[PDB]
Paper text:
[name] is a saprotrophic bacterium which possesses the remarkable ability to grow in isolation using a variety of hemicellulosic polysaccharides as sole carbon sources. It produces a diverse collection of GHs, assembling enzyme systems that can degrade cellulose, xylans, mannans, and xyloglucans, among others. Effective xyloglucan-degrading GH systems (recently reviewed by Attia and Brumer) contain exo-acting glycosidases acting as debranching accessory enzymes and endo-acting enzymes (xyloglucanases) that generate short, branched β-(1,4)-glucan oligomers (xyloglucan oligosaccharides).18−23Exo-acting enzymes are expected to address each of the glycosidic linkages reported in xyloglucan branches, though the reported enzyme diversity falls short of reported branch diversity. The work presented here comprises the design and validation of trisaccharidic xyloglucan (“XyG”)-type cyclophellitol probes and their validation as bona fide, predictive tools for the identification of xyloglucanase activities and their discrimination from [name] activities within a xyloglucan-elicited [name] degradome.
Recombinant production and characterization of homology-selected [name] xyloglucanases in the [name] genome identified [name], Cel5E, Cel5F, and CjGH74A as specific xyloglucanases, but the roles of each of these remain unclear. In order to validate the ABP-XyG probes for profiling xyloglucanases in complex biological samples, we first established the potency and mode of action of ABP-XyG-N3 as inhibitor of various previously characterized recombinant xyloglucanases. Incubation of pure recombinant Bacteroides ovatus BoGH5A,13Paenibacillus pabuli PpXG5,19 and [name] [name] with 100 μM ABP-XyG-N3 for 1 h under optimal activity conditions gave near-quantitative labeling as assessed by intact protein mass spectrometry analysis, while identical treatment with ABP-Cel-N3 gave minimal labeling. X-ray diffraction data of the complex between [name] and ABP-XyG-N3 shows near-perfect mimicry of the known glycosyl enzyme intermediate state in the −1 and −2 subsites. Irreversible inhibition kinetics, measured using bespoke 4-methylumbelliferyl (4MU) and 6-chloro-4-methylumbelliferyl (6C4MU) XXXG fluorogenic substrates (see the Supporting Information for synthetic details and Tuomivaara et al. for oligosaccharide nomenclature), showed probe selectivity values ((ki,XyG-N3/KI,XyG-N3)/(ki,Cel-N3/KI,Cel-N3)) ranging from >17 for [name] to 0.13 and <0.0026 for HiCel7B49 and BaCel5A,50 two well-known cellulases, respectively. We observed strong and uniquely xyloglucan-induced production of a ∼65 kDa ABP-XyG-Cy5-selective outer membrane-associated enzyme. Pulldowns from saturation cultures using ABP-βGlc-Bio, ABP-Cel-Bio, and ABP-XyG-Bio unambiguously identified [name] as the only exclusively ABP-XyG-Bio-reactive band, Cel5C as the exclusively ABP-Cel-Bio-reactive band, and Cel3A, Cel3B, and Cel3D as the ABP-βGlc-reactive bands.
Numbering used by the authors: 24 to 396
Write the structure that this text describes.
């Protein structure tokens, strides 16, 4: 093999604290929070402006009404490029963060994120073999090191794998199978752990078009699918007008501008959100496969001013409430994308520097959406 085996201590299978099926575990999660721009940051945990994950942050996330965290994690930059050995200090750091989250009674989804793109931007026949070898080596290590956590810990094999056609989807299916095999090979509680597999680009329409099967699993009923959501992009993330379209500042029936109508959406309103989520209910949920809505948020436009800003913030809160509520009604588990920022074009709802709530308006909307307030 390209790399040595990192399945060095496989353990007898253990179902202790692993008694929930995927469907049962999904029923315990109504609202999640991503620790964005932190453990996945290129250059290190603080490189993208957030503090190291703290117990105080995880206590505040739980106390604020979240049931779960999604923890984007980088790995490649911590690995020896000859051996694929991940730094012991980094594996211990991730284990410490998982332990703190579980100490605060959160469910935890750990992934390999974009991670500088080694996998994510390389869903190609040319990279298939070398990426399967690194996927296997990395997951053997991650799974071995985190093997003793109970079913509060879930694994997600990839983030937003760039598969745009059937040929790339076949490569992605292989990367997902490698993930499952590697985790299961380590035994112990990893014989039973719920694993989460990503649709192509985590895009609902591409998933609907290209996805055909889950990986084979030695476990039964321990898999979930994952999609993300930024629809409509013009509202949620777009930071400048383009030749092909304009930023929307406003979203939601009864949160639309009567004055600057050109900043209201021309597509991607409530009916489209329902339509897209129904595709996933049809394909996955109503076939007994829960869906993790692993990443969604519409960024704050604090570069607006006055009545326009007020109207923007009211429709942004409504967008988050609507997405959360409509996801849950259709069996998608909503995980809010928080990049930690509190300035323009950001998504942090907490002030991470001081462990306080920065944006109670969006927090309230998420909790109302979840039926929590």
């Amino acid at each position: 093999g390209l790399y040595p085996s990192y399945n060095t201590s496989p353990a007898a299978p253990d179902s202790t604290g692993m008694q929930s099926t995927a469907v049962q575990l999904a029923g315990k999660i109504r609202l999640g929070w991503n620790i964005g721009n932190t453990m996945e940051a290129i250059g290190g945990e603080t490189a993208w402006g957030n503090p190291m994950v703290s117990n105080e942050l995880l206590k505040l996330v739980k106390d604020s009404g979240f049931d779960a965290v999604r923890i984007p994690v980088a790995w490649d930059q911590y690995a020896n490029q000859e051996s694929a050995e991940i730094s012991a200090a980094w594996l211990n750091r991730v284990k410490q963060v998982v332990q703190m989250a579980i100490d605060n009674e959160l469910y935890v989804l750990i992934n390999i994120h974009w991670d500088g793109g080694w996998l994510e931007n390389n869903i190609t026949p040319a990279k298939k073999d070398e990426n399967n070898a690194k996927q296997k080596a990395f997951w053997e290590q991650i799974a071995t090191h985190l093997r003793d956590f109970d079913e509060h810990l879930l694994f997600a094999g990839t983030n937003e794998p760039n598969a745009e056609n059937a040929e790339q989807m076949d490569v992605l299916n292989s990367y997902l199978q490698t993930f499952v095999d590697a985790v299961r090979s380590t035994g112990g509680k990893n014989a039973y752990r719920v694993l989460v597999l990503q649709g192509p680009v985590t895009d609902i329409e591409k998933t609907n078009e290209l996805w055909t099967h889950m990986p084979a699993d030695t476990a039964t009923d321990r898999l979930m699918a994952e999609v993300h959501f930024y629809t409509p992009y013009n509202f949620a993330l777009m930071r400048q007008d383009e030749s092909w379209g304009k930023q929307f500042y406003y979203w939601g029936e009864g949160f639309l501008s009567t004055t600057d109508t050109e900043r209201n959406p021309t597509w991607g309103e409530e009916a489209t959100i329902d339509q897209l989520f129904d595709l996933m209910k049809t394909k996955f949920v109503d076939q007994g496969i829960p869906v993790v809505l692993g990443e969604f948020s519409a960024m704050r436009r604090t570069n607006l001013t006055g009545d326009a800003l007020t109207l923007h913030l009211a429709g942004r809160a409504y967008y988050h409430k609507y997405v959360t509520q409509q996801a849950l009604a259709r069996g998608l588990l909503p995980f809010y994308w928080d990049n930690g920022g509190n300035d323009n074009f950001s998504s942090g709802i907490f002030n991470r520097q001081q462990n306080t709530v920065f944006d109670q308006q969006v927090l309230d909307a998420l909790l109302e959406g979840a039926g929590a307030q």
